[PDB]
Amino acid sequence: YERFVVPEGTKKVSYERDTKIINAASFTIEREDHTIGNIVRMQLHRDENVLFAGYQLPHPLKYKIIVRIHTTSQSSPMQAYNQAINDLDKELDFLKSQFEAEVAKFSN
Amino acid sequence: EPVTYVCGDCGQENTLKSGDVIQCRECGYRILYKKRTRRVVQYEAR
Amino acid sequence: MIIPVRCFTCGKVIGNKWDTYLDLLQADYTEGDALDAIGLVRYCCRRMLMTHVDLIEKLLNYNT
Amino acid sequence: GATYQRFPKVKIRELKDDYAKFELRDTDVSMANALRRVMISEVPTVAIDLVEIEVNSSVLNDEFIAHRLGLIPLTSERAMSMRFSRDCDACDGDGQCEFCSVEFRLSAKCVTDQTLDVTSKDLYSADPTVTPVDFGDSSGADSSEQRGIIIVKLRRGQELKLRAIARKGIGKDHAKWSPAATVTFMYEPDIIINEDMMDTLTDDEKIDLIESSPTKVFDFDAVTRQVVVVDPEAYTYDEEVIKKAEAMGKQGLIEIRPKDDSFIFTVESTGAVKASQLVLNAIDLLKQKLDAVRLSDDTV
Amino acid sequence: IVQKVVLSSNDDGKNYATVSLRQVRSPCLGDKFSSMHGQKGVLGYIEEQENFAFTNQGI
Ligand SMILES: [Zn+2]
Ligand SMILES: [Zn+2]
Ligand SMILES: [Zn+2]
């Protein structure tokens, strides 16, 4: 119904460049929960040039995430954000490969 | 269908007409339920 | 009234296990041995079978 | 674009049609929790979603019967390729369709004096052999009772004619679509029991502090007078053993540390979907969700 | 939803009419509950399943 995926007239992800601090932005993601925000922030903490990775829900009844990234120079929020998403996608590839391998050892 | 009212202890369909004294014929008891006709009804399994 | 499908806490389907539960208690088993025979390991389902009140029979007798 | 990528490992202990256990390691806790939450609430399943009752003359009511029909599990192996019925161009006729909206039928009546009960095996499905009612709890498994899920019981002048329409949904809309019925994981402990403190204290104290454990974790090897961890995976993190070691004042005796990796899953299923199919659909829906949130279009 | 219609009367013809409606309610966010020990409350927050704390059996 309307609780699920974002209707027409609103983006899925809305970017916002923070004003008062250099190397700082706030990614306001629609239609999510702790599932994606948690794995995104814990992938961000394994990076070198990142400084601050968190998410919070502006009301616990409403179904959206706001993520914040403070980074150093030699990078940006955009670079480390897309680095996080792509490396999580690669790990899900390698995990699906391992699981479909291990299913085959129940050989029928 | 007509109204087709059902008695309480007879079980017989009197098929009542315009307002008399409420009293089941073939007897004297005065219960007179109303029969459910054959319709459709919509429900959400929730 | 009838046994509920889907044990309220976890979600295992228990809606078919009622008559075999009555038969296992009918034979000679106690309730722990019966629930271990049907294979219900967590207590969220055991509390759902041991405390069920079956009221459909009293309704079937009082209709006509 | 550096590496920034950790390499998981899977090793399966047991695997049956509706059960699994695998020792996932070298991944973080949040990934395991993501797999758990997707398998409980995100993976879709076909279930009954609409009921038209033509005749009902039993002692139960309409919403009770519709509520029991909503919870009967249907086999959902074409549900990943079906579509949400709000997203279908066709099928605006409250009936059968081919990408959603399987239609069912049910009629039963008793003319004997033997108290006929209406079970799940009286639901006859149009669009057959793809979404029937589930039978694995009856046949192919000698678990409890082949009669299946009882819906109503009836007498002579009693009948029940209806027509149900199944659809597609996920567990966040209602509990009837969640195919999990158990999804959980746990850590696994690192137990580093000292041997130069264990030979100090006496044999009655040995057999006492082994006895204080509520699960059989340790074992008493009487032939060498020593103790032995025989099952780490039954430790439940309640500290009663180390608390009695504290009350006995022998510190540095045993220490127990949960390892950062090594997440032992335990996956069950209602029988609508197989277990390995649940894990693979979870990984695929995580990839679809990670796909739909990229800002790759505008780099600057 | 209408459940039944009952039409009775009295000795001096005083015709009586009875109509019963039916409803199904799930407990909403304002309802009151209690234990067996005089410890009552109001349901204030209905929470989805995967956010509760779970034990090693998954309860
Ligand atoms: Zn009469
Ligand atoms: Zn359970
Ligand atoms: Zn359609």
Side-chain angles (χ1 to χ4, degrees), chain D residues 16-43:
Chain D
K16 290 182 282 186
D17 199 3
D18 291 331
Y19 186 77
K21 180 181 284 188
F22 51 92
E23 294 178 353
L24 175 58
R25 73 179 67 249
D26 291 330
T27 185
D28 203 0
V29 184
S30 64
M31 182 56 69
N33 196 5
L35 293 175
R36 184 182 69 84
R37 294 179 62 167
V38 172
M39 289 192 285
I40 291 168
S41 65
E42 290 289 328
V43 171

Side-chain angles (χ1 to χ4, degrees), chain B residues 7 9-10 24-25 27 29:
Chain B
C7 184
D9 52 355
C10 289
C24 182
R25 290 187 290 113
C27 74
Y29 288 108

Side-chain angles (χ1 to χ4, degrees), chain A residues 12 32 34 39 43 46-48 78 81 83 85-87 89-94 96 99 102, chain D residues 1-6 8 10 12 15 28 30 37 280 283-284 287 289-290 292-295 298:
Chain A
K12 181 71 184 295
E32 291 295 330
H34 309 279
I39 62 170
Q43 181 61 44
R46 296 179 69 252
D47 191 354
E48 292 289 330
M78 290 293 292
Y81 177 75
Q83 181 69 40
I85 289 175
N86 288 317
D87 286 333
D89 202 355
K90 294 180 180 69
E91 290 184 359
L92 292 174
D93 278 322
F94 186 74
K96 184 171 174 65
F99 189 74
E102 289 292 328
Chain D
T3 301
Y4 293 152
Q5 173 165 1
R6 63 264 176 110
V10 182
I12 295 174
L15 175 57
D28 203 0
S30 64
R37 294 179 62 167
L280 294 172
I283 300 168
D284 293 332
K287 287 185 183 177
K289 290 176 71 67
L290 286 175
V293 293
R294 288 177 181 175
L295 293 176
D298 292 330

Side-chain angles (χ1 to χ4, degrees), chain E residues 37-54:
Chain E
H37 296 282
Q39 188 67 254
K40 71 178 289 187
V42 171
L43 177 61
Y45 183 66
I46 298 172
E47 172 59 43
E48 298 180 355
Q49 179 182 356
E50 69 271 16
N51 302 323
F52 288 101
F54 68 100

